């Protein structure tokens, strides 16, 4: 019916998808090894849209996890949520990889394991006779998720041409350049494949993570154990129309169709306010829906590093405001009434704009059926500031003679560096041209 195959790949893409499947059992009322609660069918009306359909009421995840590093998968099998995963769909015990840290490693390893990489991931494709598409849950940081992920964006474009492609890709961190220095090279090589060899992306910045991780979360030493908490909730938040019973844009080709203006303009800004557990003691007094979307357009919950004074000459075109759970829908048109009076979104002068609001009932659970949740999927034309940030860090590195002799020994014979530079400037010029 609407079966999606997630493509978890890389050192960071496997960990953000590990707790994504772990989030799904707590809201479906199911255990990874059994069914102890009856809340799975009376409370939740649809479960076989991301999981594989049941053979013994065991909802297998439709997931594949490949990585060159064996460290990310050795921290999985000792956890009690790995018995839900199957040891025959992806790998058996003692799976390995390369050495290995290179973008050209996984780019060259795709055609030497070409027979095996297109054998076991295609067995899940013909399980349903109407496949939705493929989401590449991969990474941009490092050479593991960026090297091999650029290969599958090409060969799955023609072997599966009538399928939706759209990824929840995480952006790397640009604070210092000591541990990694190959960061401008492997990022722009995948970013070219994300626009012409891929329809849509969902950007997730790393410098904006610790802006939120010290905002309300109150940590002193930033660890990697907090990167899975902001990411796994908004992943399950994006499929609330798709997993839980909704009516309009209840498919993944429903939501993405109403937000993309044009190809190579698909970078969607994400926002999510409620992350604090001591808000729970004051949501008993009928906290309404009239105050939760006034702060979404206000740049506080954003996960995109952008300029603060560059929003006057940029214009919103498509903005999504997803409320979940208890909505009190007699005032949801009242919340959309107050949008035109502030004009917090700059509107495009050539065409109409749209503020789309939708709702779906959440899990039968006490932290879910009590507190209001707001998921934002914006589309603003100030996203070229990240593309100006990455390009200015790209041409400055090529004048310092950095990784021009250390990178072209394997499988690179011609200069494909300006092939990425002009196509990035094509994106940056057509964005500003789009508001005439």
């Amino acid at each position: 019916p609407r079966e999606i195959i997630t493509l978890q790949l890389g050192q960071c893409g496997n960990q953000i998808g590990f707790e994504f499947w772990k989030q799904l059992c707590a809201e479906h009322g199911i255990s990874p090894e059994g069914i102890v609660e009856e809340f799975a069918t009376e409370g939740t009306d649809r479960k076989d849209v991301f999981f594989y359909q049941a053979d013994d009421e065991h909802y297998i995840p439709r997931a594949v996890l490949l990585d060159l590093e064996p460290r990310v998968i050795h921290s999985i099998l000792n956890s009690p949520y790995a018995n839900l995963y199957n040891p025959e769909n992806i790998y058996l015990s003692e799976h390995g990889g390369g050495a290995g840290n290179n973008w050209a490693s996984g780019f060259s390893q795709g055609e030497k394991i070409h027979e095996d990489i297109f054998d076991i991931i295609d067995r899940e494709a013909d399980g349903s006779d109407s496949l939705e598409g493929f989401v590449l849950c991969h990474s941009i940081a490092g050479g593991t998720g960026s090297g091999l992920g650029s290969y599958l964006l090409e060969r799955l474009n023609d072997r599966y041409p009538k399928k939706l492609v759209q990824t929840y890709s995480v952006f790397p961190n640009q604070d210092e350049m000591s541990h990694v220095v190959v960061q401008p090279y492997n990022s722009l090589l995948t970013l070219k494949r994300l626009t012409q060899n891929a329809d849509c992306v969902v950007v997730l910045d790393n410098t904006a993570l610790n802006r939120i991780a010290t905002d309300r979360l109150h940590i002193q030493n930033p660890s990697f154990s907090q990167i899975n908490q902001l990411v796994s909730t908004i992943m399950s938040a994006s499929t609330t129309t798709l997993r839980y019973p909704g009516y309009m844009n209840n498919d993944l080709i429903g939501l993405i169709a109403s937000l993309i203006p044009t190809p190579r303009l698909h970078f969607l800004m994400t926002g999510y306010t409620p992350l604090t557990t001591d808000q729970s003691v004051a949501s008993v007094r009928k906290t309404t829906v009239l105050d939760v979307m006034r702060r979404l357009l206000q740049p506080k919950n954003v996960m995109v590093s952008t300029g603060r004074d560059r929003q006057t000459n940029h214009c919103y075109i498509a903005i999504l405001n997803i409320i979940q759970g208890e909505v009190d829908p007699t005032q949801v048109h009242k919340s959309l009434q107050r949008i035109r009076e502030r004009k917090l979104a700059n509107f495009i002068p050539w065409g109409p704009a749209s503020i789309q609001v939708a709702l779906s009932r959440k899990s039968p659970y006490l932290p879910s059926a009590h507190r209001v949740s707001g998921l934002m999927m914006a589309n603003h034309t100030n996203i070229s500031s990240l593309f100006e940030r990455t390009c200015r860090q790209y041409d400055k590195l090529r004048k310092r003679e950095a990784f021009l002799e250390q990178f072209r020994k394997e499988d690179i014979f011609k200069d494909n560096f300006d092939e990425l530079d002009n196509s990035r400037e094509i994106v940056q010029q057509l964005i500003d041209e789009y508001h005439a």
Binding site: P1, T41, E42, D45, D48, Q53
Partner: protein, 72 residues
């Protein structure tokens, strides 16, 4: 096609198998209805309908007039 009288039964068993592969949470909620469709105007769409018949005394809340008002 232009509609014929056998297409009533064919679209019916198609809605059967469609609601059946979905896995409804109640198997007996599925055959509680059938579907009905005009004679042959031009097309089958915008000429089809639904018969959901109703048991004991709930039918005093649902007269056979107003199920056409829901079906239209």
């Amino acid at each position: 096609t232009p509609p014929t009288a056998v297409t009533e039964h064919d679209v019916n068993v198609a809605f059967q198998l469609s609601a059946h592969k979905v896995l409804l949470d109640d198997d007996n909620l599925l055959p509680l209805l059938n579907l009905t469709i005009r004679e042959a105007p031009t097309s089958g769409w915008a000429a089809l309908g639904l018969s959901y018949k109703v048991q004991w005394p709930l039918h005093i809340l649902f007269t056979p007039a107003v199920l056409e008002k829901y079906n239209v």
